Amino acid sequence: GAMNSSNYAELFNNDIKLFVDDTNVYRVTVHKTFEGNVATKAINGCIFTLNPKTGHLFLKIIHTSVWAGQKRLSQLAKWKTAEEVSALVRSLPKEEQPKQIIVTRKAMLDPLEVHMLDFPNIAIRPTELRLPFSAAMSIDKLSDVVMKATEPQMVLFNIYDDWLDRISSYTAFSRLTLLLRALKTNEESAKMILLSDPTITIKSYHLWPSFTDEQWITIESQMRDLILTEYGRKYNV
Template sequence: MKVIHRSVRAGQKRLGQLAKWKTAEEVATLVRSLPVEEQPKQIIVTRKCMLEVHVSFQACLKIDKFSLKATEPQMVLYNIYDDWLKSISSYTAFSHLVLIPRASHVNNEKAKMLLKPDKAMVTEPHHIWAINL
């Protein structure tokens, strides 16, 4: 996820076009910076249902691990699926990834209660979510 502080886009017009250009630049930079064996074989880009994904990623900024890092422009790389792909399909993981932040967008307090670990459950430092699917 690329966190862009609001000061970067201050005074800019055509923010939609700027976002597309910046996204393309950042994806290209990220892919080129990875070792060859870690570079993705395929990148899926979609405009369909973008509002749904946009709302979900806005809600992601309410998650402490993300919002605490959003103090300045920087590239932050997370495996946002945690270890989900070991037990569920990539389609199901993506569906959960859309639903969980949407729940946070609808009712942040209830979503935090569902995602907040109890005393017995520890969120690993490299994980985002307290739940394990």
């Protein structure tokens, strides 16, 4: 059933699983027309498909051309997500195919179940977790490949960089969700925290800066502080 606080360690066991987040698939800017009506303009989007154990990210870029001449795009976006996830699974060798796919939004369950009918032994699950994967497009290098795409493209990343050399999957996921929660709550402040010291850089082959173990503790503390501050403002508490 649903993935929650109770069954959290299941994410880091040896059964292959993927999270799928569809919140950045269909993206628009809302604007005024010459006549003073409102219209949308689609921008490039992405499916965020993540192995929480390995950090392997399957970023399927959704080019605006897929929406051309289609109706009910927010509905279509869920089905297009399920179509591409199904295509990704079929593209993987059998021993790399997930045993579970966890969708971050309940509206993805039926579309993904119907597209995966050929895979009855792959469990499609919702989650009670409020995961901050919507903030993926606050990671500069992910935002850059999505916006520059001129056609449908899959790009593979490791969202943990080289962290698993030093820390467990559980700890790497916790760091990732804290970084993304901070970027979601106050992007400007989170990005300031991450780049404030010019001597710590991002390797060409990485997404995040090359912090020492001690620097990660300072960074993680600064991210927690950012999140609590923001929360006190949101709620006046």
